[PDB]
From Swiss-Prot, chains A, B, C, D:
Transfers electrons from cytochrome c551 to cytochrome oxidase. It comes from Pseudomonas aeruginosa (strain ATCC 15692 / DSM 22644 / CIP 104116 / JCM 14847 / LMG 12228 / 1C / PRS 101 / PAO1). It comes from the Bacteria. InterPro entries: Azurin, BlueCu_1, BlueCu_1_BS, Cu-binding_ET, Cupredoxin. This is Azurin. The lineage of its organism: Bacteria, Pseudomonadati, Pseudomonadota, Gammaproteobacteria, Pseudomonadales.
Amino acid sequence: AECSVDIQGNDQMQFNTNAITVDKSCKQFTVNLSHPGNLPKCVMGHNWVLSTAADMQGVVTDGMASGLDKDYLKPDDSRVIAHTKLIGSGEKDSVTFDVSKLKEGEQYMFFCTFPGHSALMKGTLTLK
Amino acid sequence: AECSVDIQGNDQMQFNTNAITVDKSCKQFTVNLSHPGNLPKCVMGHNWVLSTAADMQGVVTDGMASGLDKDYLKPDDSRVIAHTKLIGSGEKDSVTFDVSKLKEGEQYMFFCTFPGHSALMKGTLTLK
Amino acid sequence: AECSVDIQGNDQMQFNTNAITVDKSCKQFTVNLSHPGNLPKCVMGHNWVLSTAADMQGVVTDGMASGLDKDYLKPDDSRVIAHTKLIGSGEKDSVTFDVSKLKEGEQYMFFCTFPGHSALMKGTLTLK
Amino acid sequence: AECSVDIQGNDQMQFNTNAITVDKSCKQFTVNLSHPGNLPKCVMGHNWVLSTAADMQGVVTDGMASGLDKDYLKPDDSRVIAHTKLIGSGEKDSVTFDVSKLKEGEQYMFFCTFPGHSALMKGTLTLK
Ligand SMILES: [Cu+2]
Ligand SMILES: [Cu+2]
Ligand SMILES: [Cu+2]
Ligand SMILES: [Cu+2]
């Protein structure tokens, strides 16, 4: 729609898209994450995390150490522009953030920080 | 069978077993690893690494640093009692080691050193 | 010891005992549950739930419906005399209850409410 | 624009142009590489490497041996005038170099050092 996107994470460890475009006219953007799979949060938990291409590796590495309890995210990680919680099969979650936090020109990557998933579950977010 | 076990690592990031039992009457034990998945060594490559429960973390951390070229294994890591190579979809590999290297009473863990997989891909190997 | 018992739930879906005896002289009894397995709460979680033999089936069925979030227990289930929480690999939990709640002569059963586990995970708790 | 060019490498293993013209009036030149594909750095990763036509074969052959960890480029290869990183699907990267390094009259070749890609991924860079 406008200023919002519907994204899914399945048991095949994939997002149903790898490119999100945020319209500059939007004050804020909304990401709706859903898990149409069957596997529970331990095995196939997904979340949606946004940050600069430069910070991904960092977030992913620290998230893994945080553990399942912390939704595989370092508490109050400054590198994380926005994020949903870790959801499992059948669950759902959404997050809205201020388009202002994004700065035209830079590279933005979204991905799941569940151990091993960033390998396949990642994509670019562009501010056009 | 006797003195050998068949183990699999799939695209869902899991081993098809988490407990292996090595009979003391065996002079050597063989582990046959196979990858019935579809994803390439890249994203979902697996391996089977054996070590003491105490050394797991150490091995996992250093392997990650060694990189995909090194099969996510520190070259000549003394803590590794035995290991297969990193295999991808459709591939296969095996490794035989001398049961003597195992000392009854201690704790042994087997796991995959591919970045993130240890979270779920790991089990206990016991000498009975 | 006296007025306390140490019980375990492993990955093989089994308790390390199927009979518990509560001495009448005890004012209260304590159960210490521990999970020596490797599998996470999703797949191989366990809890220790006590009730009359007659209510077990009822508790198990409703517990299943309550879902993982509720520790596979119907909230405020009156048929439940005592219970630990659902624990996964490496975790631990304990519960102490008043021996008074038990009434000599009746039949008591303890079991795990995680889906499918009550088939093997259950035992009798006697007041001698 | 002026003193910069936008180039692409897709999943079909091709550059969106095989000729780049650098204006001598430029002090330095900028190449912006983007990967509009879907395949990961792993299978369809690309990079932009500049060198004399005479050196290409050498760079490609050694870059291949360096491995994926090295971005398929021998470390500190003197034959490489300039280069971007090895990028995957959705990623992006740029490299700026001093036009001075180029010497009018000689032949310059750009290409991707990913195993096999040089067959189709290469072009000429002229200093006019
Ligand atoms: Cu995920
Ligand atoms: Cu693996
Ligand atoms: Cu259980
Ligand atoms: Cu290429």
